[PDB]
Ligand binder design. Structure first.
Ligand SMILES: [K+]
Ligand SMILES: [K+]
Ligand SMILES: [K+]
Ligand SMILES: [K+]
Ligand SMILES: [K+]
Ligand SMILES: [K+]
Lengths: 252, 251
C-alpha cells in the first residue's frame, strides 16, 4: 500500500522529531550546567596551583574518566570477566539487550562475539518465543480455575473472557514489572523511578546499560544474579507474547 | 499455524541454549580476562602520577578535585560539541525505537527518564509496524524477483528447486554487500576504525544489540554534508532489508 506506508513513515519521522525536541528540552540544561560546573573547577585548580599546567590538569581530567569509565572511587576487587559477568555478557548478546557496561577489548573476542551474535540471537529467539506461550498458556491455564467459580450469579461468560484476559495482563505485568522494581530498589538502592526505568529499558531490549541489575552479587547473594537473567528470560518471553497478542487484536 | 511442540522439544533447545551461553562465556572469559578491567588501579596510579609531578598540590586538594570532576562527569562533562544537540537528540530517539540503544549519551534528568519510558513503550511498536511495511513493499520486489530465478539460473547444471535456494543467495548477497560490506569500508575511512572494528560495529548495530562501544555518529565533523543523516538512513534501510529477508526466508 503506497498510501498507508508513507502515512506511517511520516508519522514516525514526526514522532522521531517530537521525541528529540522534548529530549532536548529535558537534557540540554542539565548538560550545560555540568559543563560550566567543570568549567568552574577547571579555573580554581589552575588558580590555586600555578605549577599545574592548563593542559596537565586536563590530562588528569581525562585519565580520571578515560581510565575509570568504568570503575569508580567515590566494587571490591571484583573481576569484570569472571564466570558470572561473562555469562551475563553472553546473555546481553542473544537477548539483544546489549548493556555494554563491560566492553570488549581483545580483537579476538570481538570476532568471536560477531559469530556469537549471528548464531545466538536466532537460537534464543526461538527459545524465547518458545517459552513465550509455553509459559503464557500455562499461566492462562491457571486462570481457568478461577473462571469456574467466577461464573454463577449474573455472570456472563462473554465477560468472563475479559475479566481474565486483563487479569492475565495484570498479574503478569505485576509479577514481571512491579515486583522486580520493588526488588531492585531494595537490592541496588535505586529510586522508585530508576527501577522502572531499568525494567522498561531492559524488557524493551534497548539496553542503555546505564543501570544494570547484575554488576556484582555482593558476597552473600545466594542466587540474586541467577534470578536476574531468570527474570530476564521469563520476563522477555512473557512480554514478547503480550506485545504480539495485542498485535493480532490490533489488526483492525 | 503454531506448533506447541515444546512438551519435549523445548527442553532440548533450552538446555542447548544454557550450554551455549556457558560455552560462550568460558570462551569470552579466556579472551578478556588477560586484558581485564581498567578499574581502580588506574585512578590510584594517575593520582600518584600527579603528586610526584606537582609538589604544590596536597593530597586533600587533589582528592576533592576528583570528586568535583566526578560530579561534573556525572552530569555530562566532556574531557578535551554538545551531547544533546538536535542531531544527537534525534540519534538518541532512534536508538530507542530501533531497540539498538547505544547508551553512549545517557539520560540524567529524572523527568527525561519518565518520558523515555512512554517513548519506548509507544515508539518501538510504531517503528515495529513501519519496519514490516518495508518488508511487505519489498515483497513486491521479491514477487518481481521470482520471475528472474526461473529464467537463466537453471539453464546450466543447476536444479530449478535448488535455484530457489541459490537465486535467493544473490538477493541475500547484494544486500549483504550494500548494507554490511559497504558501510564497513566507509566507517574505516570516516571513523578511522580498523577493518574488523567496523564489522564489529555494523553487526552489533543491525542486530540491535547496541553495545555503544563504537558509534558512527558521535559528531559529523563540520563539513560532512549528510553523513549523520546517511547514518540513520543506513540503519532505517539496513534494519528494513534484513527484516524482509528474514521474513522472506520464513517459508
Ligand atoms: K528484537
Ligand atoms: K544496547
Ligand atoms: K534489541
Ligand atoms: K557516562
Ligand atoms: K540493545
Ligand atoms: K548499550
Amino acid at each position: 500500500r503506497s498510501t498507508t506506508l508513507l502515512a506511517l513513515l511520516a508519522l514516525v519521522l514526526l514522532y522521531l522529531v517530537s521525541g528529540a525536541l522534548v529530549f532536548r528540552a529535558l537534557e540540554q540544561p542539565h548538560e550545560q550546567q555540568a559543563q560550566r560546573e567543570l568549567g568552574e573547577v577547571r579555573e580554581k585548580f589552575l588558580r590555586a596551583h600555578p605549577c599545574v599546567s592548563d593542559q596537565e590538569l586536563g590530562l588528569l581530567i581525562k585519565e580520571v574518566a578515560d581510565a575509570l569509565g568504568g570503575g569508580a572511587d567515590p566494587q571490591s576487587s571484583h573481576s569484570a570477566w569472571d564466570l558470572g559477568s561473562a555469562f551475563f555478557f553472553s546473555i546481553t548478546i542473544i537477548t539483544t539487550i546489549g548493556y555494554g557496561n563491560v566492553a570488549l577489548r581483545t580483537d579476538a573476542g570481538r570476532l568471536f562475539c560477531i559469530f556469537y551474535a549471528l548464531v545466538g540471537i536466532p537460537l534464543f529467539g526461538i527459545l524465547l518465543a518458545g517459552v513465550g506461550d509455553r509459559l503464557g498458556s500455562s499461566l492462562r491455564h491457571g486462570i481457568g480455575h478461577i473462571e469456574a467459580i467466577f461464573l454463577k450469579w449474573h455472570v456472563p461468560p462473554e465477560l468472563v473472557r475479559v475479566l481474565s484476559a486483563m487479569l492475565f495482563l495484570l498479574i503478569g505485568c505485576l509479577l514481571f514489572v512491579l515486583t522486580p522494581t520493588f526488588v531492585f530498589c531494595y537490592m541496588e538502592d535505586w529510586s522508585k523511578l530508576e527501577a522502572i526505568y531499568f525494567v522498561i529499558v531492559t524488557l524493551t531490549t534497548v539496553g542503555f546499560g546505564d543501570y544494570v541489575a547484575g554488576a556484582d552479587p555482593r558476597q552473600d547473594s545466594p542466587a540474586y544474579q541467577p534470578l536476574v537473567w531468570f527474570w530476564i528470560l521469563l520476563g522477555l518471553a512473557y512480554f514478547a507474547s503480550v506485545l504480539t497478542t495485542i498485535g493480532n487484536w490490533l489488526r483492525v
